[PDB]
Amino acid sequence: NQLQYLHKVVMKALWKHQFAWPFRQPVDAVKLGLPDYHKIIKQPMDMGTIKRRLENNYYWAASECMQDFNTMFTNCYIYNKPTDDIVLMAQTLEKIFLQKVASMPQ
Amino acid sequence: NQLQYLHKVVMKALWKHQFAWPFRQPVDAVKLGLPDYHKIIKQPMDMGTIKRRLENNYYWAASECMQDFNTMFTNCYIYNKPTDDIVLMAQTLEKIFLQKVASMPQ
Ligand SMILES: CC(=O)Nc1ccc(O)cc1
Ligand SMILES: CC(=O)Nc1ccc(O)cc1
């Protein structure tokens, strides 16, 4: 029920959120012109990957899925400048993620 | 039971962790020589404040306490350089926080 909740409640709300768009696919450092991205970011993560993983029964515990969300947001905070819009977008999304996690079943 | 779990399980493990020390008290931008800290960081947070809040029944829901932890970690990622040791310290602590949150009661 935990993973089903993360898929059907948490990911459903985040995926369609207006600020989701920069996070729905992996960062393409070449297309985005970010030559140092993978020098700085050790473990890339995005909602597209998390969504596919939920759909495919990839996770064993809710904790792993939660860690993936955390990694995605943290990468954003670490790589980007504090004043970048994407940082505010991540913050908004992460607050919702945490709120929903707080109501997750045991 | 949620808030009691965050206090007696989550905060107990984080407080005494070896990487806790930079997070046990508010960032003193004057003493640490960080003149731009409060220009960049809008909502300061630390484990000392969270611990006092848990002790004093400040929180209404686990979500608020969780948000405070998140804010503390996010501030760290946003303000500091990616290669700073404190960033790795925050990451380690946040992973533990999330792991414990995953086993929190409803
Ligand atoms: C998730 C993330 O950091 N995305 C991202 C970063 C910089 C940029 O210029 C475009 C997109
Ligand atoms: C929580 C935090 O960012 N602390 C912190 C940042 C920079 C520094 O030089 C010393 C401490």
UniProtKB/Swiss-Prot annotation, chains A, B:
Something else known: Some specific inhibitors of BRD2 that prevent binding to acetylated histone are promising therapeutic molecules for the treatment of cancers or inflammatory diseases. ABBV-744, a small molecule, has been tested on tumors with success: ABBV-744 antiproliferative activity is mainly restricted to cell lines of acute myeloid leukaemia and prostate cancer and is able to displace BRD4 from chromatin. GSK046 (iBET-BD2), which specifically inhibits the second bromo domain, is a promising therapeutic small molecule for the treatment of inflammatory and autoimmune diseases.
Originating species: Homo sapiens (Human)
Protein name: Bromodomain-containing protein 2
Outcome of mutating residue 37 to A: Abolished binding to histone H4 acetylated at 'Lys-12' (H4K12ac)
Residues binding a protein, per UniProt: 36, 79-81, 84-85
Domain comment (free text): The first bromo domain specifically recognizes histone H4 acetylated at 'Lys-12' (H4K12ac). It also specifically binds histone H4 acetyl-methylated at 'Lys-5' and 'Lys-12' (H4K5acme and H4K12acme, respectively). The second bromo domain recognizes and binds histone H4 acetylated at 'Lys-5' and 'Lys-12' (H4K5ac and H4K12ac, respectively).
Similarity comment: family membership: Belongs to the BET family.
Localisation per UniProt entry: Nucleus; Chromosome
Record note on what altering residue 84 to A does: Abolished binding to histone H4 acetylated at 'Lys-12' (H4K12ac)
Protein's job: Chromatin reader protein that specifically recognizes and binds histone H4 acetylated at 'Lys-5' and 'Lys-12' (H4K5ac and H4K12ac, respectively), thereby controlling gene expression and remodeling chromatin structures. Recruits transcription factors and coactivators to target gene sites, and activates RNA polymerase II machinery for transcriptional elongation.
Domain Bromo: 1-104
Effect of residue 78 to A: Partial loss of homodimerization. Abolished binding to histone H4 acetylated at 'Lys-12' (H4K12ac)
Quaternary structure and partners: Homodimer. Interacts with E2F1. Interacts with (acetylated) STAT3; promoting STAT3 recruitment to chromatin. Interacts with CTCF; promoting BRD2 recruitment to chromatin. (Microbial infection) Interacts with herpes virus 8 protein LANA1.
